[PDB]
UniProtKB/Swiss-Prot annotation, chains A, B:
Present with 7330 molecules/cell in log phase SD medium. This is Cytochrome c isoform 1. The keyword Iron applies. Its main location: mitochondrion. Binds 1 heme c group covalently per subunit. It is found in: Mitochondrion intermembrane space. The gene is CYC1. It comes from Saccharomyces cerevisiae (strain ATCC 204508 / S288c). One of its GO terms (biological process) is mitochondrial electron transport, ubiquinol to cytochrome c.
Length: 108, 108
């Protein structure tokens, strides 16, 4: 990979401070500004049901792997021009690594 | 993605004619020349237990997604220099697509 396992604990707190505002990760969690992320890994972009995605994300049709998720998080709009995810991104690979480690584990 | 779903039926027969010689895909299937492929998607390269992999594959530490699997199949040795998988590859994207479609489904 080009993703290195980080601290799932560190990633949990990054999630809460950077992602929670718009998303849930638990199975059965609701869509909010952003879609619930349970089971995101291996799923393609813009496929959660009952969520209204941008045309851009559906069509980018990104396959979510720890690798892909990394570029996305780096700079969402640069990666999927047109996305309405209003996040400036996680510029440090160390933060991304911790977050993805946490997300790999909690969205399963 | 850059992978398009094909014919799972077509992929089953490509598997049997090109992959079966060295691999099994069923859960509980044994390692043969090549490792059993059950649950390969989302797993990193060189991690099936009880199989003796090349140094190269372990270290390539490729994360298996439909996308990755595609490049691999295209030309194994060009993608993982040092691998002992003795396959010349699947040059047509249409064949790859059918195979991966089948593999996505059978290795789950
Ligand atoms: C609101 C201010 C958000 C914050 C903070 C984060 N995300 Fe987000 N996300 C948001 C929206 C509005 C959308 C949908 C975009 C669209 O163009 O329709 C998303 C989407 C995602 C995705 C893609 C989901 C898919 O089903 O394809 C992922 C993987 C994602 N968001 C993850 C994520 C993470 C891990 C965040 C914290 C670093 C995060 N987002 C912040 C809104 C918002
Ligand atoms: C014997 C002549 C093989 C044929 C035909 C195919 N594969 Fe293979 N595969 C083979 C070996 C000896 C190995 C291990 C390589 C090493 O360097 O140790 C592999 C490995 C794979 C992998 C990687 C597995 C992992 O656990 O990381 C995959 C995804 C794979 N093989 C798939 C595959 C497919 C789909 C094939 C048909 C087109 C196929 N292989 C042919 C041996 C042989």
């Amino acid at each position: 990979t080009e993703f290195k396992a980080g601290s799932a604990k560190k990633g949990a707190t990054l999630f809460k401070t950077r992602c929670l505002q718009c998303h849930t990760v638990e199975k059965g969690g609701p869509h909010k500004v952003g879609p619930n992320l349970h089971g995101i890994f291996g799923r393609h972009s813009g496929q959660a049901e009952g969520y209204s995605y941008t045309d851009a994300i559906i069509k980018k049709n990104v396959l979510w792997d720890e690798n892909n998720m990394s570029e996305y998080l780096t700079n969402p709009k640069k990666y999927i021009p047109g996305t309405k995810m209003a996040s400036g991104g996680l510029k440090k690979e160390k933060d991304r690594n911790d977050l993805i480690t946490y997300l790999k584990k909690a969205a399963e």
